Design a protein around this ligand. Structure first.
Ligand SMILES: NCc1cccc(NC(=O)c2cccc3[nH]c(C(N)=O)cc23)c1
Length: 228
């Protein structure tokens, strides 16, 4: 997160750190007792490495009673996702067993009504991604409140030039933004999961390149099929 602050420890119990060989790689969101939603581009070129999900965490390195690293039984990228596109950038990870729930580990209700979030709605995005242009990684969870950018402004030639489909949403990227290591994390609006961070457009903190988030309501049938 660029231009954010340190999050209140365990105040976002749905927050997951998706790891590869013991290192934070991507953000994630606990959507059911045994399922973590993330971005498909995260699993890209990971084929061989060990993927785990860390739940109940604030600090990536320090011991916390609620912290628990889970192994992954199944990694389910969206069938229509592809390395060279920003579309269908979703991944579902099935934990080895149901997560032990509590005040610091809880799934987040997610949006099932396929209608746009109002322009300007303030949404929360959290992550352990880079915090400056040099690439400094925070040990603890960061967050920023970002206003939703209307799709038409986002689709301007000066911005993402028609790449924002009805299945994608934007949020302002002026100084405050999600960045590398924040992909797969949640965009939460009015206490409900609305979007998943995509690294589709890679630049961070440039207002002419808004943040792109995959709309979970647009993939409601896919999420339900995988969990079934
Ligand atoms: N709000 C904009 C936003 C949100 C989330 C992530 C990103 N930017 C990246 O993730 C990124 C950046 C640079 C090199 C990179 N290399 C790779 C890689 N090999 O996976 C990713 C990146 C941008």
């Amino acid at each position: 997160i660029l231009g954010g602050r340190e999050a209140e420890a365990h105040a976002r119990p749905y927050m997951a750190s998706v790891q590869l060989n013991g290192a934070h790689l991507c953000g994630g969101v606990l959507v059911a007792e045994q399922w973590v939603l993330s971005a498909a581009h995260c699993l890209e070129d990971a084929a061989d490495g060990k993927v785990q999900v860390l739940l109940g965490a604030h600090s990536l390195s320090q011991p916390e009673p609620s912290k628990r690293l889970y192994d992954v039984l199944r990694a389910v990228p969206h069938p229509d996702s592809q390395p060279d596109t920003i579309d269908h950038d979703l991944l579902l990870l099935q934990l080895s067993e149901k997560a032990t729930l509590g005040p610091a580990v809880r799934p987040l209700p997610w949006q099932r009504v396929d209608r746009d979030v109002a322009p300007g709605t303030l949404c929360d995005v959290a992550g352990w991604g880079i915090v400056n242009h040099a690439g400094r990684r925070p040990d603890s969870l960061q967050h920023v409140l970002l206003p939703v950018l209307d799709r038409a402004t986002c689709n301007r030639r000066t911005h993402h030039d028609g790449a924002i489909t009805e299945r994608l949403m934007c949020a302002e990227s002026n100084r405050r933004d999600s960045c590398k290591g924040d992909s797969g994390g949640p965009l939460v609006c009015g206490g409900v999961l609305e979007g998943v961070v995509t690294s589709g457009s890679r630049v961070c903190g440039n207002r002419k390149k808004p943040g792109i988030y995959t709309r979970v309501a647009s993939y409601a049938a896919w999420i339900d099929s995988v969990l079934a």
